[PDB]
Amino acid sequence: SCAEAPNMKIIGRRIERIRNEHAETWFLDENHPYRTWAYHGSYEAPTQGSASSLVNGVVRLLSKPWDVVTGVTGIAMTDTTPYGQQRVFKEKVDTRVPDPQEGTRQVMNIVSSWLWKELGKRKRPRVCTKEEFINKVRSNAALGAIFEEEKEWKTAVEAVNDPRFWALVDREREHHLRGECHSCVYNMMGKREKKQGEFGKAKGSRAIWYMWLGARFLEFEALGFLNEDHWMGRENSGGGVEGLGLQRLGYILEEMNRAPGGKMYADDTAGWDTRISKFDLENEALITNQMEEGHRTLALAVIKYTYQNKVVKVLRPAEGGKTVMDIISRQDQRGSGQVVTYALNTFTNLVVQLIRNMEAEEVLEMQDLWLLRKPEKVTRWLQSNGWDRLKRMAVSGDDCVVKPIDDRFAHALRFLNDMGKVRKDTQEWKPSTGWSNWEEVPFCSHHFNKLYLKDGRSIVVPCRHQDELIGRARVSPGAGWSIRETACLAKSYAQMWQLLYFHRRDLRLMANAICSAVPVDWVPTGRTTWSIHGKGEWMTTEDMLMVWNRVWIEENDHMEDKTPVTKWTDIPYLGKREDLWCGSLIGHRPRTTWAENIKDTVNMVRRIIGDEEKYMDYLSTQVR
Ligand SMILES: [Zn+2]
Ligand SMILES: [Zn+2]
């Protein structure tokens, strides 16, 4: 019910450009629903999104028992219509978290500037080049063109090979260096998901926003070194884990459990991106004091004009079926699709958890909440304990797992709530619940189990509820996708299961069915997960038994005995209790029928794709 006071001198340039590039249809809506955001104007626009997602036909026909399981059919029920997005905005994005008291702002100031120093000892900030951007971007990124001069392209790889795209970039950078910002504007779309189960992970209603491709280069140019040089990697950050895949996250949770201390706390912040305060964006900007003078100017141009002052375009339903685009402003919060969204969240989250250990270890008191009593004590505790507490953390974005020195961590909440990083689904002052067994700790939408191998070895495999994995695969990201295109996406989900969730009985059988129903020569396409830890080693025509040995045996630094595994039958499953607990259907009437007649179902899918294609029998590589 307060703010914004829009800094019109910084954002007003882009406002009048969007206004005057639509000056015939620009108007001011008196009935706009934006309470905590700064409204600027509206103009007519076509509709976008869909009330429901299309279902992958190949995966659906090969997963009949789950047509009645609400846990998997609900994942395809995402809503992206302008009405569905506005329902998310008024609930999760149109908020205002009160300012932390002055004493709390001091701790964040001290700890943040301390971590940037530790993070930049073995590393050196630098500018990122044009060729680094051309090699990193995939053929189909988000073009995100919003202006007239920016809609000259159709694909992302097409733009980067055109000297015209790098001409618009040079002008905006020259606009930045002169003190203005002319074209860095966010596109915002929303997803309202019909959800969920009790403790189902990963997917909730959220807002997705990103800038256009040229703006994200200037973003990647000034601060892209955080991702390219692996500043949030575990080797350099201690508590980070950037770069490690789902085949390695389990070992860290096990590594932490052996160290002495209390329980393992994996509390989850509700709406982490929205809970970012204007003081945290200042503390994240402390990295600017380590850059060369040419770099420092480019960085502040991105920070002041893209991070600390944002302009967003949002759709909204109007009268008579027509829709309309809104222009709004916001000074705090984090855009979900900023180039360094993951790195800046991992940093801030490390600072938050570092502070929470202080409140538990009786370093900070309620005195310090409203005014720092003795600020000389904060820097002392960080140098004799700060790095020891980072190495007992695992932070990936807004996901964190902390191993405190004792169980006073569960009650250290006053500094946490004042910083706005409130916990999800808990009373404001109820102590946090901890985990005694690391194999139950949630982290990155997964728990991690220890799989004992046939020859006396062991890997730590990732695991999650089975309905979330089948439901995701049954989703086709767009209409008009061909039969071949949907089959290649089905092959990607199947071969991903063969690499990470092979220990699940239903997933290995369904994967062998999909691989037996999709032609053997066809190259898998698509994106099976948007998580940073899904490195995508399954996107290949290579024999999945070969790639299994590479990520679990050959290149596993936790596996000293590197003797290869020859058969798929030599790799066990989880215990039937653990498999059933995570959503398996072993023993049920319809699942047993589906397993018996899976060859008949695979043969029918083969006829949809074509009798002419060459197929392989991956079901005969499994007898049990
Ligand atoms: Zn700009
Ligand atoms: Zn499990």
CATH, residue 15 = 3.30.70.2840
| Residue 128 marked ligand-binding | no
Distances (CA, A) of 45 to 32, 34, 87, 516, 613: 16, 19, 19, 45, 44
Query: 325 and 342 share a domain?
Result: no
Q: What are the residues facing 452 on neighbouring strands?
A: 458
SS (H, E, C) 372-418: CCCCHHHHHHHHHHHHHHHCCEEEECCEEEECCCCHHHHCCCHHHHH
Q: Could you give the CA distance from residue 108 to residue 320 in angstroms, rounded to a whole number?
A: 50
| Cα diameter, the chain | 78
Kindly give the distance from the C-alpha atom of residue 445 to the centroid of ligand 2, in angstroms, as a whole number: 11
Whether the Cβ atoms of residue 312 and residue 291 lie closer than 8 Å to each other = no
Kindly give the distance from the C-alpha atom of residue 451 to the centroid of ligand 1, in angstroms, as a whole number: 50
Structure tokens at 67: 């047509």
Query: 485 and 419 share a domain?
Result: no
Q: Could you give the CA distance from residue 219 to residue 561 in angstroms, rounded to a whole number?
A: 44
Q: What are the residues facing 396 on neighbouring strands?
A: 399
Q: Could you give the CA distance from residue 525 to residue 546 in angstroms, rounded to a whole number?
A: 19
Q: Under DSSP, is residue 457 helix (H, G, I), strand (E, B) or coil?
A: coil
Kindly give the distance from the C-alpha atom of residue 262 to the centroid of ligand 2, in angstroms, as a whole number: 24
Kindly give the distance from the C-alpha atom of residue 449 to the centroid of ligand 2, in angstroms, as a whole number: 7
Domain stops at, among 444, 463, 492 = 444
For 283, other C-beta atoms within 10 Å of its C-beta total: 21
Query: 473 and 557 share a domain?
Result: yes
Ligand lying closest to the C-alpha of residue 11: 1
Q: Could you give the CA distance from residue 228 to residue 239 in angstroms, rounded to a whole number?
A: 18
Whether the Cβ atoms of residue 151 and residue 212 lie closer than 8 Å to each other = no
Q: Could you give the CA distance from residue 617 to residue 515 in angstroms, rounded to a whole number?
A: 8
Query: 43 and 122 share a domain?
Result: no
Number of domains in the chain: 4
Q: Under DSSP, is residue 320 helix (H, G, I), strand (E, B) or coil?
A: helix
List the Cα angle 530/531/535 in 5-degree steps.
100
Q: Could you give the CA distance from residue 576 to residue 584 in angstroms, rounded to a whole number?
A: 9
Query: 216 and 232 share a domain?
Result: no
Kindly give the distance from the C-alpha atom of residue 461 to the centroid of ligand 2, in angstroms, as a whole number: 9
Query: 123 and 146 share a domain?
Result: no
- Residue ranges making up the domain that contains 133: 128-181+190-223
* Environment class of 389 (CB within 10 Å of its CB; exposed 0-12, middle 13-18, buried 19+): buried
Query: 326 and 338 share a domain?
Result: no
Domain stops at, among 429, 444, 459 = 444
DSSP assignment letter at 522: P
Structure tokens at 381: 């505790």
Q: Considering Cα of 549, then 551, then 555, then 559, what sign does the dihedral take?
A: negative
Q: Which residues contact 384 (CB under 8 A, 6 or more apart)?
A: none
What is the full DSSP assignment across 6-58? --HHHHHHHHHHHHHTSTTT-B--TT---SSSEEEEEEEE-----SSPEEPHH
Asked, as a colleague might, if the bond just before 4 is cis with ω within 30 of 0, I would say yes
Structure tokens at 134: 């051309």
Kindly give the distance from the C-alpha atom of residue 140 to the centroid of ligand 1, in angstroms, as a whole number: 23
Q: Radius of gyration over alpha carbons of the chain, in Å?
A: 25
Ligand lying closest to the C-alpha of residue 504: 2
Distances (CA, A) of 323 to 19, 29, 583: 17, 13, 41
| Residue 376 marked ligand-binding | no
Q: Give the distance from CA 545 to its chain's centroid.
A: 29
Whether the Cβ atoms of residue 97 and residue 421 lie closer than 8 Å to each other = no
Query: 531 and 383 share a domain?
Result: no
Domain stops at, among 279, 299, 331 = 331
Whether the Cβ atoms of residue 390 and residue 237 lie closer than 8 Å to each other = yes
Ligand lying closest to the C-alpha of residue 439: 2
Structure tokens at 124: 């050196």
Ligand lying closest to the C-alpha of residue 445: 2
Query: 353 and 230 share a domain?
Result: yes
| Residue 444 marked ligand-binding | no
Q: What is the resolution of this structure in A?
A: 3.0
| Residue 118 marked ligand-binding | no
Q: Could you give the CA distance from residue 396 to residue 243 in angstroms, rounded to a whole number?
A: 10
| Residue 2 marked ligand-binding | no
Structure tokens at 44: 């007519």
Kindly give the distance from the C-alpha atom of residue 543 to the centroid of ligand 1, in angstroms, as a whole number: 46
Query: 114 and 200 share a domain?
Result: no
Q: Which of 286, 443, 416 is nearest to 355 (CA)?
A: 416
Q: Could you give the CA distance from residue 368 to residue 375 in angstroms, rounded to a whole number?
A: 9
Query: 56 and 21 share a domain?
Result: no
Query: 572 and 473 share a domain?
Result: yes
| Residue 131 marked ligand-binding | no
